[PDB]
Design a protein around this ligand. Structure first.
Ligand code: HEM
Ligand code: HEM
Ligand code: HEM
Ligand code: HEM
Ligand code: NA
Lengths: 138, 146, 146, 138
């Protein structure tokens, strides 16, 4: 599970993320769509060109949901269970895709806050993202 | 796989700016810290008992430089990667029995290390090309399993 | 990969006793029930709304027979599996964009279906040979990604 | 997570596994070593020939641990926490191996109880084995 150090490491890095939800979320999605083009299949209703209004709005929601889970890190499943039915039942998102989006989020964090993303913080954030992915695929 | 002109430019262009020693040491240390089961393969390196020990271990640092130098052999002949990595495939598959999922994990860590070193110069298109490269190398490394 | 005389015998011997229609229908239905995200690829098959609906669906059963028949093409030319699956690789990789981890999951399900149909005749050595076969087929199916 | 139906499915099939702990555990391990020979690396101290006393004794312990997790299926992590330190910290078992052992266990169940291992039960047992593997790699 998430240790006490994991939780403080995650909360610590998110003090740098929390003010950039739209910017970092949009960049995470744009990186995912360009690096892993098959992920575009889940967004046929979107304009997927750079900086489109739909990508910006959706990216803000994704990161906002992560911030929610960070604020209630003691029960991530309780905060995000409302997204489980959407992703696992309605959308049928292949579980491999959560690792792809998580990789893109870590790249965004590394680009903007390289000194904060130490090996130990990286380890904690990987466990946090894996825990979120398990809730959303449940 | 096939490589576009833009992909080749993104790969060779970034490669000339990579600190092979520092990025290689960092990627290997992150593998051992983020995915600690990988430490089982490196007991000959001695003290891997903490993040501090791993990051200061001279055998980890030396090995990480050799690993990234090999990625450079891929950069320097992108259409011949499978042959370039044939002997390394025998080592990792036949001798070490490293599960290929670990090759994917090292490649993903390398991308995060490159992103940290290059910041916004590591554009989405640059990440796409480098992610393709680490995937192609991982596939070549797993060849002797099939 | 290299096939031993014993592996070839275990594969061809078991294959002659396989109920292609029944084992194929059961393997595909289990894929859709055990790993429900795979249903996203089969919306054209109609009612996948419950395990009972999936197991009784004419299109799931017909497709499962076609899938297992394709495995039979591997059994009948074990040294040419790669050429046999080249067109199917184009379909699944270029057109359907099925993640290759799903090929692994289908192969593992097939092993469990064969175990259920053959009981103790599915010896550990037989399982080893068939696991190798489904791995080789999954690799041939994933080729057009690399 | 495990739904209420998953929990009911797992317990039912385990009433037939209990009382065969040594036999089914030994067969699961023998299948794993033969089907996936690299897994033998974790047991250099064992005699790995068929029906060796170490394989039989260890297989009984593995299945006994599974039966224990089934008996306390509502909190698998508390029940298996001691084994987590052993597998993740001391032994450093690569997480891929938990899927291999789980596959071999499902093969053993299918061989002996094919009618009990319906698609819905297979689905629930897969989720249970995945949950155990997640605890043991924490
Ligand atoms: C960290 C992991 C993820 C988080 C936190 C997350 C969060 C969210 C949120 C908050 C929504 C909006 C829910 C609503 O408006 O009611 C959403 C919708 C959606 N998500 Fe995710 N998501 C994640 C991963 C993924 C992945 C990996 C995919 C596919 C590759 C995906 C595809 C979608 C789609 C297609 C929608 C519907 C979007 C729309 O119609 O506007 N999500 N997600
Ligand atoms: C995926 C990209 C990888 C590349 C390009 C790569 C490359 C290399 C190279 C160049 C060597 C040097 C062989 C020599 O000096 O003779 C090596 C050795 C080795 N590699 Fe890898 N490797 C990769 C992944 C991994 C992973 C993921 C692991 C383990 C989890 C691993 C474990 C080892 C070990 C144990 C050695 C032997 C070290 C020694 O005895 O000094 N490799 N690899
Ligand atoms: C080793 C694994 C697999 C083999 C040998 C295989 C084989 C085949 C074959 C022979 C066909 C041709 C059907 C026809 O001729 O009408 C087919 C089609 C198809 N396959 Fe696979 N397949 C495999 C795995 C998968 C997986 C894992 C998925 C999805 C998760 C998938 C999705 C599909 C779909 C959607 C079609 C088209 C069905 C239709 O439109 O009628 N396949 N496959
Ligand atoms: C369902 C998954 C598993 C369960 C329930 C399980 C359970 C156990 C138990 C109960 C023990 C003995 C603990 C003790 O005596 O204090 C043990 C030890 C051990 N396990 Fe696992 N295990 C699992 C998976 C694995 C896997 C996947 C591997 C490696 C491929 C593995 C390798 C070992 C080894 C090497 C030992 C030490 C055995 C000895 O020295 O006697 N285990 N496990
Ligand atoms: Na090679």
């Amino acid at each position: 599970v998430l240790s006490a150090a994991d939780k403080n490491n995650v909360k610590g890095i998110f003090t740098k993320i929390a003010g950039h939800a739209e910017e970092y979320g949009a960049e995470t999605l744009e990186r995912m769509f360009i690096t892993y083009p098959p992920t575009k299949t889940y967004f046929p209703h979107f304009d997927l060109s750079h900086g489109s209004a739909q990508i910006k709005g959706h990216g803000k929601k994704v990161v906002a949901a992560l911030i929610e889970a960070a604020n209630h890190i003691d029960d991530i499943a309780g905060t995000l269970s409302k997204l489980s039915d959407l992703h696992a039942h309605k959308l049928r998102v292949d579980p491999v895709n959560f690792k792809l989006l998580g990789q893109c989020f870590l790249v965004v964090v590394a680009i903007h806050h390289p000194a904060a993303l130490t090996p130990e913080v990286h380890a904690s954030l990987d466990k946090f993202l894996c825990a979120v992915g398990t809730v959303l695929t449940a | 796989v096939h490589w576009s002109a833009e992909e080749k430019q993104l790969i060779t262009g970034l490669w000339g700016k990579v600190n092979v020693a520092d990025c290689g040491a960092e990627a290997l240390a992150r593998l051992l810290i983020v995915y600690p089961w990988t430490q089982r393969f490196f007991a000959s390196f001695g003290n891997l008992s903490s993040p501090t020990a791993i990051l200061g271990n001279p055998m980890v640092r030396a090995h990480g430089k050799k690993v990234l130098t090999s990625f450079g052999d891929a950069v320097k002949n992108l259409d011949n990667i499978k042959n370039t990595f044939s002997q390394l495939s025998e080592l990792h598959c036949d001798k070490l029995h490293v599960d290929p999922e670990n090759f994917r994990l090292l490649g993903d860590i390398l991308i995060i290390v490159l992103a940290a070193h290059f910041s916004k110069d590591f554009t989405p298109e640059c990440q796409a090309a480098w992610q393709k490269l680490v995937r192609v190398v991982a596939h070549a490394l797993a060849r002797k399993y099939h």
